[model samples]
Target chain A: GHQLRLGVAGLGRAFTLMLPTLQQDPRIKLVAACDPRGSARAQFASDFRAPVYPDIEGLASNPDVEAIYIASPHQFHAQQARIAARHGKHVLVEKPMALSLGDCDEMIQHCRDAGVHLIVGHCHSFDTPYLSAREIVQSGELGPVRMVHALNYTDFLYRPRRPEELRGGVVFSQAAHQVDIVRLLVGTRVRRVRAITGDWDPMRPTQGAYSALLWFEGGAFASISYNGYGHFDSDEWCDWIGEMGGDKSPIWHQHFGPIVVSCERGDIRPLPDSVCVYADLAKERRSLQRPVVPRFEVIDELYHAVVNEIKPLHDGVWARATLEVCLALLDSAGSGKDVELP
Target chain B: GHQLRLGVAGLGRAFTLMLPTLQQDPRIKLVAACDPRGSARAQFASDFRAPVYPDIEGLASNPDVEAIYIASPHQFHAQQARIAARHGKHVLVEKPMALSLGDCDEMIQHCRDAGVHLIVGHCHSFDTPYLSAREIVQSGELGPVRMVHALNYTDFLYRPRRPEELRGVVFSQAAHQVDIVRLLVGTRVRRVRAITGDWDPMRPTQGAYSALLWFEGGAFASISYNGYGHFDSDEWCDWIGEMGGDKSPPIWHQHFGPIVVSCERGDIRPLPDSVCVYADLAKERRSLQRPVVPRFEVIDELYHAVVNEIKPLHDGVWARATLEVCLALLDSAGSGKDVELP
Candidate 1:
């Protein structure tokens, strides 16, 4: 009968960024923290004004904490989520949910059996621009979706890893954003996927590229493409930066913001310019000049959803679905062919 | 000897757009126009400043015209191009080159036998934006070009035919753009293809949507889709469109300018953005930006070749290859499965 009790594990950047958000939320209380490094534990306890524990097990076992936040290595999510479930605690897992769908399923089933809620922290589920895209697609002006394509063309690594070791391919790492995205847009569980090792980064387990197709019972289909190697500054894989000498930046749509959807019927491009071109479907061509919506409406709405407990639009099930899509991609990459989910 | 004297047939929207460019060019002279549509011929004479004739026979037999531009309906292109070829004139045929590839092959053979050039007018070749995408892919900096998904999302047509009357599927329109992209991107001809179709606008003879998959000799593949029904203002298909929103926009990159390349090292997404992100393979993070170069420099150079008598970067053969790709797509769409080139 408490608002919410929380614990933080892993003293990394993710934990640091999340701490303030949880602390500031009136409905949540950060009861404990765990760090493997002694100085990190002391620094965490002092900085966040919360108790620090020696390790993950101790943190999960804390009686005062109702939920545990897991931000560990990609390989540790399943085991960590399972252990937290054993304590009858709800879990908030970062992007991937787990390395595999099977592992995530196991964790979810365990949490359900234990009567504890599980929340997967999929950033794309929260990202305003992508959330807006999903809303547009769902609005149905585009018609039954036949395919989906997404691109996050950012630099591969700001930090270097051993070339021989795998980055687990883009499907596991780079595609986490898209994994959540396709689910949000398509609203269908992925029926099949294929991830050929990309020619771009052979040193990794899979290619920097991935393409996926999902089908619904009604026979709608969507395709997804993701390449982590794109410039993070890019708005889309094919956004015009200024190759034609336009004054505007080619990466016009601000990332971590709203997407500019050029719905075909209008050719009525929404641009933040001084004058509007009078165009509509009945007419030949009309360009509309409107400022990009300045207010951050989606993020605010999502926050309200969390506060209301009326079920967030893209909630645990949605995150799990996106994660499932990504996991299928990984399997497809390893098999070197199309993979279907059972 | 006559500065490549030209004859034009059909005064459709495409021809309307091209007239000014042709008239202003010094290396070419428009000698005649032909169309059964008396109004079309009248408009052509007034707009293009060319002599107007009544039919293809008059235009093809015009001794002063060395070449004919075939811009007619989907069903009429092959026969018209063949007639021009038989008259000892080079033919520039608008694409889908014919209703089927068999007719296209015959037109090719006819042109060969008649000792006249037969070029499929895949205009993306003349459009610089498309060429930029290809130049980036083939530069090898992007590595062996893997997949090319080019799309054009537009509603420029004032009043599109009802789904039941629309003439061709997405492949019919998408093929021209993507073929130019593939020809520009892939180093070799695609070895095999898989195809699917969607958006049945209920056209008796046309499909409203199309998608395709083609593999480069290397490891990459491509999937393209274009669905116009999504953009139409009709309320009849709203439910179908809404159901599809969870998947993809009915549009794909049909009117595309940039092509994405997945290589052994990273993704190559060319934009006009000034700052380019570099790879951070270590922490699996990305955020390095550097001064970028425009890929269209090569495209501009290629355009000069077509305007002059010099060899083109992509020629009739490349356009023919694209036609072949679409023919296979049509075959598979009717059959509902993957397809390979003959």
Candidate 2:
């Protein structure tokens, strides 16, 4: 099989994390790269022996680049994705896909018009544990899913950030992963959202915490709890292992606190690299292990979509739906009411 | 100090759990008891060498009984409590206080007019871990509380039940978590948004719920409970049974779930016998150890209120406030709107 020729935008933190997967995967090749930072472009060009550009347009125009991976900042996603689409290159964009639903729609329309595929990247839904949990629920072995509870407490807000980054808060940056995973496991459209957001620290001056309840179309519901003020580390509940399968000093073992799916006859809990299913009929707990290289599944989806001309799981429509829920969460918090979805 | 002569109504599961604590405590004496079941009354009379009666009135008329502990069925609490109050005996009632705010109000009024103290019992707020967490929050060493996340999953709904016991998750199970969160937040609940689930047709009742609570002073809580029996939250609490003992092999018990309280400077999570505090200054999580004696603190509060004349922590007014939030959760689920409280 021929490797998919790829170009990259925004050679920053996200790109740094994904660089290993891009290099190691046999199905994709990094043929071109771009960044405004001269140092970054120089380092990439020297390391990969590939051409580097100062902007997305230059990268998109490269004749050898067949696909564009857009990991740029939140504000640049829509415009850069449309540029890639116009260049007739398949596009894989990082989460929040865009700041607004209008921009998300435009990206989708541009990609559709250009006969190119668009996929959303790097949400935890693409991780192995969540994928396994989703498969378990979809297999009909656990019966119909009734409830999903997802929560995380991290130091995200307190991390070093530019002023613009601080303004978006947790809803724009972090909730996409949680909302995407819940939607994947529940396998339904959200009917309504009710939420309460907390921006308690004046020094931070951004939403640091939120608690939301989402009612799904088929009577299933999810509760999302996120606190980014750095006070609690939810990883402790998961055996001190970080979400990306990194090991830390062991501390506490509580319930699997990250995300749990409750079905009619059983429950599924996702751990770092494995999933636990407690089935009522089986009368025993079962552990299913799904080990994978970090970010490998995401690239796998992109490869299959580009090579076979097939639709990806986290396509433009699905990404837009997740974004809609994120916006409704914010609106409900502001209005002190439940926001209904169509 | 003189022992407070006590009479207990109901004499069923709750009474069985309390019997050990009552027998061990030096501050009170079991002088009389009552239950509708002739066999239960006969056993109690033989076990304690005390008089046992067929009804609350017979128990309350005993001159030697200075206080009554109402552990009767949920429907009879209001009436039996009034009977005890009219007999000029202090009252300690198990939770829900009563089913409705009106019934709770009557219980309070009758107790006040008769000069008898009214204390609500046996919520997890009295558990050692939660009490320690509440004290830590009140100390302000962690700064003001910003958010609280509490959740539990158990076989509560599928447990053996009298037909009347199938009321719902909100009335039967939510009170414990709600009372704990309210006690930790130290403020009135301003609004609630919730979605409840009754997915099982065989045991048709509200089996699960997820609620978003906004407190008066900007604090918030996400409380979720699942009682359909597939998963056990006790696994998260170090397999400690709800009564602070090792869970049996088959695992049938209740867990208040795990609670994480996020504050301005730190986070607090309750373990079975210790509360973990993650303060920014410390830079490492610290576990504060405390002893766990189930129902001991409930009786401790009652002893202080009746003998020392100090106000009880979970008094009639506090319980009524907790019940108000519970009702709001159900109302929000029904109306698909945020229910506001004054």
Residue-wise C-alpha lDDT for candidate 2, range A1-342, written one tens digit per residue = 398899999887777767767887888889999988888788889999999998989999998999998988879999998899888999988777998999999999999999999999677788766777789888999888899999988888777754222123589778888888899899989998888898877877888889998888888999998888776788866767875566778211112238888998888887774567877665543454434345678987898898886679999999999999999999988987779999
In angstroms, give how far residue B127 of model 2 lies from its true place.
1.7
Chain A (alone) TM-scores for all candidate structures: 0.71, 0.93
Interface RMSD, Å, model 1? 7.6
Q: Write the per-residue lDDT of candidate 1 for residues A1-342, one digit (tens) a residue.
A: 245677876766555545545655556667888866778778767876878987778998779887777766657778877888888776777666676667767877887788666676536445444444555456665444444444444445333553222123456555766566555555666666655445444454435555554444445455556555543334322233321113333222223211122232211122222111122324322222221332123223334444444444544555667666676666766665566766
* Model 1 Cα lDDT, one tens digit per residue, B114-163: 87666665354544334444554556554565555444433323245432
| Candidate 1 chain B: 10-residue stretch with minimal lDDT | B234-243
lDDT score, candidate 1, position A84: 83
| Interface RMSD list for the candidates | 7.6, 1.6
lDDT for each candidate structure: 0.53, 0.82
